[PDB]
Design a protein around this ligand. Sequence first.
Ligand SMILES: OC[C@H]1O[C@@H](O[C@H]2[C@H](O)[C@H](O)[C@H](O[C@H]3[C@H](O)[C@H](O)[C@H](O[C@H]4[C@H](O)[C@H](O)[C@H](O)O[C@@H]4CO)O[C@@H]3CO)O[C@@H]2CO)[C@@H](O)[C@@H](O)[C@@H]1O
Ligand SMILES: *[C@@H]1O[C@H](CO)[C@@H](O)[C@H](O)[C@H]1NC(C)=O
Ligand SMILES: *[C@@H]1O[C@H](CO)[C@@H](O)[C@H](O)[C@H]1NC(C)=O
Ligand SMILES: *[C@@H]1O[C@H](CO)[C@@H](O)[C@H](O)[C@H]1NC(C)=O
Ligand SMILES: *[C@@H]1O[C@H](CO)[C@@H](O)[C@H](O)[C@H]1NC(C)=O
Length: 309
Amino acid sequence: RFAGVNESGAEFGSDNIPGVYGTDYTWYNTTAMGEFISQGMNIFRLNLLMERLVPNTMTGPMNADYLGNLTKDVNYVTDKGAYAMITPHNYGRYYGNIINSTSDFEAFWKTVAGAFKDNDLVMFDTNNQYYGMAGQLVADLNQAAINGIRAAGATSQYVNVEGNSYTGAWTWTTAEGTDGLTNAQTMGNLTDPEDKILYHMHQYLDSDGSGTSSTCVNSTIGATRLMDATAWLKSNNKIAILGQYAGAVNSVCEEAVEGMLDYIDENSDVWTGAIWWAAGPWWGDYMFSVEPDNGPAYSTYDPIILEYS
Ligand SMILES: OC[C@H]1O[C@@H](O[C@H]2[C@H](O)[C@H](O)[C@H](O[C@H]3[C@H](O)[C@H](O)[C@H](O[C@H]4[C@H](O)[C@H](O)[C@H](O)O[C@@H]4CO)O[C@@H]3CO)O[C@@H]2CO)[C@@H](O)[C@@H](O)[C@@H]1O
Ligand SMILES: *[C@@H]1O[C@H](CO)[C@@H](O)[C@H](O)[C@H]1NC(C)=O
Ligand SMILES: *[C@@H]1O[C@H](CO)[C@@H](O)[C@H](O)[C@H]1NC(C)=O
Ligand SMILES: *[C@@H]1O[C@H](CO)[C@@H](O)[C@H](O)[C@H]1NC(C)=O
Ligand SMILES: *[C@@H]1O[C@H](CO)[C@@H](O)[C@H](O)[C@H]1NC(C)=O
């Protein structure tokens, strides 16, 4: 169903706010995403920095310039009939502080969603990879985001909710927040007036699930790492999307990736698709880059992504 790529770059140099366009961060290569769309890819997760989109205070107005760049890339993707997911890539933090005010987060999402409220090909993603946080707070922030999105009149779009502990699928039931609570203990009770919640988890295939190593543990490690989360989703009648995953260019990773995507296809009653990490124009020889012109992983995994589209 959903099959596509992350676009990463507009959130780079996150320590430099607002940062310098062309030095700290950049926006995306529409010629490259046009190739992906022409191939049949139908979703692009557009990563961005909260402090650049809504500077100084998360309840404030949106920066016209950075919003203007976001909107051009969103409209490029959606004018060509693909989904654009808007992802504040902030780990649950704003100017480095854990986001502790559900009211402020509701307001931030009301503001952002208001700019895209009539575009049904837009998807909202409450925040990338909350971590190191009270589990209850992460659930409460996801709920606040849903509230603000629908309060803006953005009623057609899926809302991607992300768990604590880097929203890892393999640790959904085991990783503990600051309050001792797991994602399984906190994220089930989310409600949406439009019933369009996607449980958005990430899954890497290396030893510690971080994706920093090119070595995938073994040929089945992806599917096996989704099994516990898939039971939680099936049992609690939720649906999900694999919003980041990757393997490097070697035979074990390629088999593990194939096997993961087959597992999601076999469990399509709960898994709606998968989004590769990552494309974007500033990755160079990054082992996971599928950017067409120079991504080391493009020629191996671009066909695999399309095979599950
Ligand atoms: O995944 C993308 C995202 O990953 C980030 O790195 C994470 C990584 O995802 C993963 O969550 C990893 O989790 C470890 C964790 O570090 C603990 O060490 C944990 O261990 C525990 C051990 O299993 C025992 O239970 C013991 O009793 O307690 C130990 C911890 O106290 O095991 C978890 C997985 O099993 O943590 C890293 C970050 O440290 C980032 O790389 C991020 O940038 C990336 O986007
Ligand atoms: C943008 O994508 C095109 C098409 O793949 C590529 O030829 C070009 O080099 C890319 N530009 C940048 C800055 O990466
Ligand atoms: C993108 O941002 C720059 C400032 O960094 C601004 O000059 C430009 O007009 C923006 N683009 C759009 C389409 O608004
Ligand atoms: C979810 O549970 C928490 C506390 O357990 C709280 O935010 C609220 O009571 C619940 N949310 C909804 C929408 O019921
Ligand atoms: C793959 O690795 C996981 C985690 O280390 C392990 O539990 C599992 O037994 C391994 N599978 C095979 C077939 O070796």
